[PDB]
Structures are given as C-alpha cells and as structure tokens.
C-alpha cells in the first residue's frame, strides 16, 4: 500500500529477484526489482558517498556512488515522479540485514527540494543537513531498529556495543517535515540528496543494503521487509 521511490545501494545479489550477480546500485520505482542497475564495487569498512538528483524538466532520477581513491558508479532512469509519488511526500534512509549482515551506518545526510513557480522571485525550498546525529533527534522519525547518537551517527540497523552488526535487522529514518515535490504553478521542481555511509561486515558476503527513498508521508516499514527487501517493500513483486 505504501508508494516507494528509491535508490538502492544493494550489497547482496539476490539473483532470484532480478539482482545482477554483484553488489550494485539501483533505481527502484514501486518495486525492489530495480528498473535500472549498475555494478558497484562496494568497499567493506570504507566511508562511501551517495548522490541523488532529479528534476521535473529532465524527469530523470540519477545517482552516483563513490569512495575516496576509486572510480564511481552511476545509474539513471527516465521517470516522471509526478506520475508515481503524491504531491506531498517524506524522504528517508532505509537499510536491512538478513541471514547475511553489515553495519548500515550513516555519517551524514543532506537534502534539498525546490519548487519554482512562474511567479516573479517565487521559489519554495527545503534543505536540511545532518553531519552529527544526536540521541534525541526530533527532526527525524526513526522506525524499526534505527538509532541515533552512537558516535554522532545514524545506525539504520542493529549493532552490538562491541560494534558488530546483527542479522535480521531493519530500520529507517525519515525527515520530520513533509516535502512538497509538486505545485500547480511549478515550472521546475528539483531535489537532491547526499549521504555518507560506512558498511562494514565481518563476513565476505555483506547484506543487504542501504536506500534513500521517497514515500507517502505516512510510510512505515512493511512487514517482513528485512533482508533483500531493504525495509522498503512488503514483497519482491
Ligand atoms: N518519536 C519518533 C518519531 C516522531 C518524531 C518526533 N520528533 C522517533 O523516535 O523518531
Ligand atoms: Ca539484493
Ligand atoms: Mn538490487
């Protein structure tokens, strides 16, 4: 019942649900079966950076994911998000572990949304930036196992004191304020997101991934959306 648009950093290849046979980045429109993917040379224990951009003129959602000293991966999909998402949405980060696992640590997260009308000098805009997350983060909605304040970080999935990730975990953080991605007099609407992330696993096979998403405002973690479903989807349709 939730409507989900997402960019996925999928760390575990579930080839039965259309994943390529490698860690990849994907654009997901209302399904975990990415409309478009690109190989991603994920680096266990390194701080990666994800960038997501879109506008209403190009109607192209794109993402680039990089680490220091490495080539980047990029993926794009032509989609009019005004025909997918409602006029008001929330934006968030989601992550999961299954029988395979990893830390899903967010060190920073920023977002900008702009609606520009045909009115002279009439931009509407939201921008937030989190470089340091705190124990009691009132401008975030945390769902599932997501916690804030450990080392100034957002831990999307469960991690023990000692610092090792737990399997079968799922968590999300959504920005408190609803975001307006369309208005009747808009001539261009754009958003961008950036997050930095540290995926570390004691295992050779980490799972399952991190996603930036945009949903209906009332979105919650669907049942059984641990593991391959990334805390985003009720199933693999
Ligand atoms: N209180 C919930 C969600 C509502 C946010 C209110 N500041 C949380 O733990 O994130
Ligand atoms: Ca997967
Ligand atoms: Mn995938």
From Swiss-Prot:
Taxonomic lineage: Eukaryota, Viridiplantae, Streptophyta, Embryophyta, Tracheophyta
Question: Which residues participate in Ca(2+) binding?
Answer: 10, 12, 14, 19, 208
Classify the source by domain of life.
Eukaryota
Membrane-spanning parts? none
Q: Where does a carbohydrate bind?
A: 12, 99-100, 228
Keywords, A to Z, come to: Calcium, Lectin, Manganese, Mannose-binding, Metal-binding, Toxin
Binding site residues for Mn(2+): 8, 10, 19, 24, 34
Q: What is the annotated role of this protein in its UniProt record?
A: Glucose/D-mannose specific lectin. Has anti-inflammatory activity in rats. Induces histamine release in mast cells from hamster and rat. Induces lymphocyte proliferation and IFNG production. Shows toxicity against the aquatic snail B.glabrata at concentrations higher than 20 ug/ml.
Write down what this protein is called.
Concanavalin-Br
Family note: Belongs to the leguminous lectin family.
What Gene Ontology molecular-function terms does this entry list? D-mannose binding; metal ion binding; toxin activity
Q: Which SUPFAM superfamilies match?
A: Concanavalin A-like lectins/glucanases
Q: What else is known?
A: Binds one manganese (or another transition metal) ion and one calcium ion. The metal ions are essential for the saccharide-binding and cell-agglutinating activities. Is being tested as a molluscicide with potential application in controlling schistosomiasis. The causative agent of schistosomiasis depends on freshwater snails of the genus Biomphalaria as hosts during its larval stages.
Taken from the record, one Pfam family name reads: Lectin_legB
Q: How does it assemble?
A: Homotetramer.
